[PDB]
Structures are given as structure tokens and as C-alpha cells.
Amino acid sequence: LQFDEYKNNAMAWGTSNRNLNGEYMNFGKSGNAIKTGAGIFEQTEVANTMY
Amino acid sequence: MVNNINWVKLPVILDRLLRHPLLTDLNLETAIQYTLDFISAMGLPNVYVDKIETIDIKEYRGELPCDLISINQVRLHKNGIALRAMTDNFNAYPTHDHKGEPSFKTQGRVIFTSIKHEKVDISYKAIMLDDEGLPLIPDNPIFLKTLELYIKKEWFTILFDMGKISPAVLNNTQQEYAFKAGQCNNEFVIPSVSEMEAITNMWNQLIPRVTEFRRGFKNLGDKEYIRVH
Amino acid sequence: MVNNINWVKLPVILDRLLRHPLLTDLNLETAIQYTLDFISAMGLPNVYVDKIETIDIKEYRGELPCDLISINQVRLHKNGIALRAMTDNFNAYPTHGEPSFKTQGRVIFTSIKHEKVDISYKAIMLDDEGLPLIPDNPIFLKTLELYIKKEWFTILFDMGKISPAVLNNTQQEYAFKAGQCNNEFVIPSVSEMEAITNMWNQLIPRVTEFRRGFKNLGDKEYIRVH
Amino acid sequence: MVNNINWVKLPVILDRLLRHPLLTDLNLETAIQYTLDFISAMGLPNVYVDKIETIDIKEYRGELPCDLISINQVRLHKNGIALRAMTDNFNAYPTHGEPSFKTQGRVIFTSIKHEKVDISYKAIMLDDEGLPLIPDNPIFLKTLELYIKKEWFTILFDMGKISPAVLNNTQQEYAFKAGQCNNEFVIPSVSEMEAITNMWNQLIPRVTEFRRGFKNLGDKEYIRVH
Numbered sequence A: 001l002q003f004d005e006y007k008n009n010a011m012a013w014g015t016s017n018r019n020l021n022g023e024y025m026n027f028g029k030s031g032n033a034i035k036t037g038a039g040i041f042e043q044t045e046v047a048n049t050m051y
Numbered sequence B: 001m002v003n004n005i006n007w008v009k010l011p012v013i014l015d016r017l018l019r020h021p022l023l024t025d026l027n028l029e030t031a032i033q034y035t036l037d038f039i040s041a042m043g044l045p046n047v048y049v050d051k052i053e054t055i056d057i058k059e060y061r062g063e064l065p066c067d068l069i070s071i072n073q074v075r076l077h078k079n080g081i082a083l084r085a086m087t088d089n090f091n092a093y094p095t096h097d098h099k100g101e102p103s104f105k106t107q108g109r110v111i112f113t114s115i116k117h118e119k120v121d122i123s124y125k126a127i128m129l130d131d132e133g134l135p136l137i138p139d140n141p142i143f144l145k146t147l148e149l150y151i152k153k154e155w156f157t158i159l160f161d162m163g164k165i166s167p168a169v170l171n172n173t174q175q176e177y178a179f180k181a182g183q184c185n186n187e188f189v190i191p192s193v194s195e196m197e198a199i200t201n202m203w204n205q206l207i208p209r210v211t212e213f214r215r216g217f218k219n220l221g222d223k224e225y226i227r228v229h
Numbered sequence C, D: 001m002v003n004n005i006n007w008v009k010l011p012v013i014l015d016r017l018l019r020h021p022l023l024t025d026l027n028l029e030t031a032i033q034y035t036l037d038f039i040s041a042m043g044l045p046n047v048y049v050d051k052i053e054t055i056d057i058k059e060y061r062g063e064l065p066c067d068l069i070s071i072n073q074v075r076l077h078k079n080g081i082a083l084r085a086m087t088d089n090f091n092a093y094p095t096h097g098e099p100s101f102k103t104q105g106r107v108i109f110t111s112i113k114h115e116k117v118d119i120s121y122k123a124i125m126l127d128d129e130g131l132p133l134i135p136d137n138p139i140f141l142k143t144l145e146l147y148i149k150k151e152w153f154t155i156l157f158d159m160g161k162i163s164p165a166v167l168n169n170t171q172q173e174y175a176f177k178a179g180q181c182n183n184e185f186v187i188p189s190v191s192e193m194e195a196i197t198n199m200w201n202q203l204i205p206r207v208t209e210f211r212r213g214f215k216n217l218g219d220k221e222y223i224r225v226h
Helices: A002-012 B010-017 B028-042 B143-162 B167-187 B197-203 C012-017 C028-042 C138-159 C164-186 C190-200 D012-017 D028-042 D140-159 D164-184 D193-200
Strands: B049-056 B070-076 B104-106 B110-113 B119-126 C048-057 C061-063 C070-076 C101-103 C107-110 C115-124 D049-056 D068-076 D101-103 D107-110 D116-123
Touching (some): B010 B028, B010 B143, B028 B143, B028 C138, B070 C190, B110 B119, B143 B167, C012 C028, C028 C138, C138 C164, D012 D140
Antiparallel strands (some): C061 C107, D049 D116
């Protein structure tokens, strides 16, 4: 129930950590880059977004 | 080597040289350099003393002992796993991912390893010293005769460039050195009756042993017994 | 190399040379140049300190470090892929693949526009002064003494101040000690023969070590039991 | 080349020559000729600097740049198709194909009438002044020191001011360093062997690297797995 809450909240609320220079800087516990993708609520807000 | 390497001080070599009345202006200062030029050119590993020292690696770097000349093997202090050699050109340098086998690299008074924070044991070779801080030379009178001839060869070369020695005297000294410097090479190299048993076990193997470097070359000369069926 | 490179200064070579009463007019100034002729003519790779340094490629070009002599490799910073060599004749030039590099002076021409690359190179080891530091290995020091002896005795022989059999003996003694010193610095040790034993003895060949930093060249190739 | 080409001015070779007191009448005027005769005699393509310039062809003829020595390639500026060589005896000449070029003086004779072409050529690197700029590499300097010494001692031997044994040593001391400086500047590095390794080992051989600017020459040839 907690791993599926990890699977839903990363699909719904996932923010891509690629900087504008195209390099990730969030590093894990062994030193390698954590590569995260864009979720469903970030990929919808690029074209027709409003506030 | 067949014989034992007994140690004598450096003024033994000036008992022999100043028997020649042309070499009487040789000194200890002149004999110290020509002994070290000789020991290094001959390169017999039985002239150096075998020492083992544990040093600690800080950040892919360790501080190396002072009296070292050459490292036989480095190992790890916790495992006993030996380290081979660094073929990497990019050892401790990280990519911007900020990203297998232990290895080492030695240039000066510093050792460059592939491990970050660990103690390593270094089996090296030094010069054996006296009560004084002088080198201590072997007792073998093949070594002492060809060291006598080497110091006589470099001194007579200086007299021949000045013009104070006929060319047939240097040409004879260069000849008599050339034989005794090969005979000294054959003496200090050719294995003993005890040391040919350690080669009889290595050479004769029904199932070949090809990983003695992972150990400390400990079972290089161990007998490979085979069960009888 | 079996032995280690314990560094000593350049006046060490004049304790040895000024023992000769014909070479008493050699200086530190002349020992500096005749050392630099001797490091480069021999070209032994153990005398060079191995440094690594990152540059920034601006537009197919970047500057090069001030103490560079020879580049071992150049690799990309983010990926890690080593750059091979530029075979192109028309690199930065547009009209109307695998990356590559080419270094001539203090500039390196790469095939990538705006990137960073790590350069692993070689320098001369300096001193507290700005002077080169030499190994104390008495096979190296003896033949470096004989190089300065031979180039000085050549000068005297052209002026007529040295017998023709004296330069002939000094040219002979150098030609042995230059090939003996060469083999002293290039024969592999017990620790470096394992890096050749594991490279040579391969059932499945590894032929792509250059994409890495020649890192796994000495790695033993293990085969499972089935 | 394992090393790099770091530049020094011409009078560094006169720091080295005038240590010999039988050469102390040399000038900067004398070093300019005997180096340019030398640099051309070795013919090393690492000493020359690579430049690329787009010219325009008027009618089977074009204007060539002023610093040129040897053209690597000529390609079309619109296509990228390189030009081979003019084997035609009758190029522009009508009676009553593949593009080509032929360059004699400051003129390049092509087989295309009105186009723009890119010429990858090799030039001499120069100073603040307009004088040639030699490598600092102490094998190149040691044999350029011996080249100007050999050509000065030849003049003396013809004048009868130098014994045959002095010139015969300099003719021999040059003759060894002339091969060593050749081999210093030609033998490939650990990075230039990968231009050769990816080219030598090919299962489907590539035989059309001249149409490109020799760009894909040392590219690795990958085979799919099936």
C-alpha cells in the first residue's frame, strides 16, 4: 500500500530534475545521478497553461 | 643465489684498490658514489633488504617510506588481496555523473591507489645501512673483485681522457671488468639447490597455477600433489 | 619499471661531472639544457608527472594547460567517452559521428562545439625553483653524466683539444649506458606484468579498452564453471 | 606524435649553436635559411599549421591563399564532395564528370566553371614578426642545431679549416638525429593509434573516405548481434 502510493504519486506528481544545461545534480547514496521524469501534471502544463 | 650474503663495511673495498699504486687517491667519498652506481647497474635483488610496511591511504594517495627503492607487491590489509598496477589514465577523477579491481601506481614519495580509505601493506626493498649512514656491501669476493674493477674502470677512464694512461691499460681494464661483471651476474642469480626445488614445483604442474599474484606469491614453489585413483 | 623514481635536484649531476678535471667548466646553466636534451631524446614515460585537468571547449576549441608536454587521453566530462583523434580535414568548417581531438600548440581542436573535456597529460616535475627534477637512479644519473660528457667532448674534439680515441671511448660508453637506461625504465615489474598477464591471456578478447580510460586493461578475465 | 608541438622563436636555436665557438659567426639571417631548408627536408606534417579557406572559382581557375604550402584537400562548398586530381590533359578546352583540381602556382585549375570551394591547406606558423616558429621539442632542436652545424662545417671543410674526422663525426651525429626526429614526429600516439585500429580492423571495409573529408577514417565499425 505504500509502494503503490509511491507508484501513484510519482506518476501524478513527478518533477523532472534535468537542469537547463542538461545535467542532473541530485546525487544518490553511491554518488550517481538521480534521473527523474516529468509526471502527468507537469507534461500537461507546458502548452496551454494559465493562472 | 647459492651463497649467503654477509655484510662488510665500505673500507674493505679500499683495502683492495689502494694495493694498486695508481688508485691511491681514491677516497670514501669517491667509493660511496661508485658503489651505488655499481649496485644499481648490476641490479642483483639479493643485495637489497626485504622490508614490509603498512601505510594508510587518505584519498587515493598514501605517503611512502623513506628508504624505499622498489616495491615487490602491495596488498590490502583487511583482505590480503594484492593490487596489480594502475593502467587507468583517469583514476580519481570523476565524471559529472559523479561516478572494480584494486590497483596502485607509484612515482616518488607517493603511492596512487584505486582505493579511497584503506590500509595497504607494501613489501619493498631498501639499502642495508651501517652504524654510519653508509651502504653495507656483500662479502662475496666475486662481488668485491668486480667492484674493485668497476671503480678501477671509471677512474682509469678519467686518466685516459686526461692522457695519463696508455690505451692498452684501459682496454685491459675494460676487458677484465667485462668478464667479472658477467660472472658476478651469474653468481647472484643462479638458484640454489634449495631454490631449484621452488622452481621444480612451479614448472611441473599437471593442473596449472596461474593466480599466484593474487596471493603474496606464497605458493609459487609449492608441490602440486595428485591423488591416486 | 622495477625501481621507484626518487627525485633529486639538478646540481646532483655536477657532483658527478666535476669529478672529471676536463669538465670543470660546466655550469648549472649548461646542465639545465643538456638535461632537457636528454629527457626528450630518451623519452622515458616514468620521468613525467601524470596530471589530469578539465578544460572548457568554447567553439570546437579550448585552451591547454601551461605545463603540458604530452596528452595521454582526452575524454568527455559528462559521458566519459574518450576522444580518439581527428582524421577530418574540414572539422569546424560548415558547408552551404565518434568525437575526436587534435592539439597543436596551446589549443585543442575538438569536434564538439560547447562542452567540457578532461585531459590526462604529462608534465615535467619541477622544484622549489622552476627547474626540472631528475631521478636519483644511478643508471639514469650515470648516462645523463655521459650525455653531458659526450656533448662537451664533441665540442673539444672539433676544436682539436681531445684525442680521437677519447671521444670514441666516451661515445662507446654512452651508447651502452643509453640502451641500458632505456631498458631500466621500460622493463615491466612484477606488479605490472600482472597487468600484461591479464591482458594477454583472454579467452574472450577485450578490444575496446580505449573507450574506457584504459582502466580495465589489466583486469583478469574470469570464466564461469558450467 | 606522442608529444605536443610547443612553439619557440628562431633565436632559441642560436642559444644552442653558439655554445660551440666554431659557429659563433652565425646570425639570425643564417638561421632563417638553414631552418627553412631543414623544416622542408624533414617534411613533417606536424610542424605546419592547418588552415581552411573558401575561395571562389571564376572559370576553371581560382585564387590561392598567400601562406599555402601543401593542400590537404579541396571540396565543394555546397556539396561536400571532395575533388580528386586533374588527370585530364585538356581541362577547360572545348572541341568543336567527377570534379577535379590541379594547382601550379597561385592558381588552382578545377574542372568546375563557377563555384565556391573549400581548400584545406597547411601553412607555416609565424611570430610577432614575420619569421618561422620552430617546435621547442629537444629532439627537433638538437637536430636543427646539428643541421646548421653540418652545413657550416661543410663550408669550412671546403675551405680547409676542419679536419675530415671532425666533419665525419658531425655528418654522423646529424645522420642519427635526423632519423630520430623523423621518428619522434611520425610514430602514432595512444590516441592516434585508435584512428588506425578502427580502420585496420573492419569486417565490411570502408573504401570511400576521400568523398568525406577523411572524417570517418578512424571510426569504429560496429556489427549488430543477431
